[PDB]
Amino acid sequence: RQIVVGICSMAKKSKSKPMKEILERISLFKYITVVVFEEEVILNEPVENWPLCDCLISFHSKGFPLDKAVAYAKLRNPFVINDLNMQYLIQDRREVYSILQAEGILLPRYAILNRDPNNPKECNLIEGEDHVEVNGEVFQKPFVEKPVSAEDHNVYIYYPTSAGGGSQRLFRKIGSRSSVYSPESNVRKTGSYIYEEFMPTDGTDVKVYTVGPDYAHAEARKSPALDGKVERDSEGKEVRYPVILNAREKLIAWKVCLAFKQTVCGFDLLRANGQSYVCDVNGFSFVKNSMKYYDDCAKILGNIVMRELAPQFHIPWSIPLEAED
Ligand SMILES: O=P(O)(O)O[C@@H]1[C@@H](OCc2ccccc2)[C@H](OP(=O)(O)O)[C@@H](OP(=O)(O)O)[C@@H](OCc2ccccc2)[C@H]1OP(=O)(O)O
Ligand SMILES: Nc1ncnc2c1ncn2[C@@H]1O[C@H](COP(=O)(O)OP(=O)(O)NP(=O)(O)O)[C@@H](O)[C@H]1O
Ligand SMILES: [Mg+2]
Ligand SMILES: [Mg+2]
Ligand SMILES: [Mg+2]
């Protein structure tokens, strides 16, 4: 019998072009059958009625019942590609940063401001014109202010007086824009935030996409900290710039993939001051518009499934070679 790979995510993800590109390729594996769980089933059926699988690829996005996925994995005990419980922690930037620190991964100097919504003024924040003090720790402008919820993309950057003051307000892309300037120079007064040092890059962010700990694709985009206008080619796709990871960065990718237990993992790197700093870990994420990524990702995922489960199924399997980039 076939080894069944189950895909469990919201339909927007399960029917996305990159998902479909990868699944058609995984399906080329002789002994693998792919089953995509229907969103209506995920949302409305108890987990006892969900399809069986031997290997589970499942990940959280908006509206996804992560508690049900975890209960399904508990019930059926499949081989899990991206750990489900870690996906609760990935929603909280404080937990992400704590894991990165515990792994010796360079990240911006930071402090957490936890604010009681009942007594918002009592928290340990002192604000000057050109700096803040968070639990006594000083951040000179420019600094970054991130909501503790990793799903809240309202990240603000505060400029020093020497550069005109005010702030850049980033947000989930709305059309041709990913940020805007604001004359406001004072920090937000409601909510809990991570404050961190601004790392000077060349104006680009590096996005890294792992498929297991030994393969990572990287590419760069214009930072929204810049001016907020999204760069587009004549075709209307967002401009992306080529990146090859250095030896240190390839190790970063290995560590992030393993520490978060996300085989398929996206994260952000800031190249600054001759080092590379992780500033965000997003979990499950596919590269778009690269035929070579689709090929490599599907092959790697298929080989992981076979290596783990071929002996159980008495299917003969010799471990092949695999790419890094
Ligand atoms: O609801 P918001 O937190 O504000 O943002 C959603 C995106 O969901 C982010 C999210 C929220 C909760 C958990 C994980 C991820 C969601 O991402 P995904 O998790 O579905 O990938 C995003 O879609 P995409 O990544 O495809 O751009 C938007 O969802 C629109 C939406 C749909 C249904 C109800 C509300 C909102 C977007 O909504 P708006 O455009 O109205 O802000
Ligand atoms: N410490 C920093 N120094 C300089 N730039 C930063 C810093 N932190 C964040 N940024 C910039 O601000 C952007 C958004 O911050 P990030 O921590 O990536 O938030 P996000 O909202 O989780 N993004 P994503 O989940 O990738 O959609 C980054 O891509 C960088 O361009
Ligand atoms: Mg097949
Ligand atoms: Mg990011
Ligand atoms: Mg993020």
Swiss-Prot record:
**Residues bearing Phosphoserine?**
S182
**Signal peptide stretch:** none
Q: Which domain of life is it from?
A: Eukaryota
Q: Where in the cell is it found?
A: Cytoplasm, Cytosol
Impact when changing K207A: Loss of enzyme activity
Please give the coiled-coil regions recorded for this protein.
none
The residues the record assigns to binding substrate are K12, K13, R172, K173, K207, R221, S285, F286, V287, K288
UniProt: ATP binding residues: 93, 146, 153, 172, 196-199, 205-207, 223, 268, 280-282
Q: What disease is associated with this protein? A: Deafness, autosomal recessive, 100: A form of non-syndromic, sensorineural deafness characterized by prelingual hearing impairment. Sensorineural deafness results from damage to the neural receptors of the inner ear, the nerve pathways to the brain, or the area of the brain that receives sound information.
Domain description: The C-terminal acid phosphatase-like domain binds PtdIns(3,4,5)P3 and InsP6. Despite its similarity with the phosphatase domain of histidine acid phosphatases, it has no phosphatase activity.
Report the function annotation for this chain: Bifunctional inositol kinase that acts in concert with the IP6K kinases IP6K1, IP6K2 and IP6K3 to synthesize the diphosphate group-containing inositol pyrophosphates diphosphoinositol pentakisphosphate, PP-InsP5, and bis-diphosphoinositol tetrakisphosphate, (PP)2-InsP4. PP-InsP5 and (PP)2-InsP4, also respectively called InsP7 and InsP8, regulate a variety of cellular processes, including apoptosis, vesicle trafficking, cytoskeletal dynamics, exocytosis, insulin signaling and neutrophil activation.
Q: Which family does it belong to?
A: Belongs to the histidine acid phosphatase family. VIP1 subfamily.
Return the protein name: Inositol hexakisphosphate and diphosphoinositol-pentakisphosphate kinase 2
Encoding gene (name)? PPIP5K2
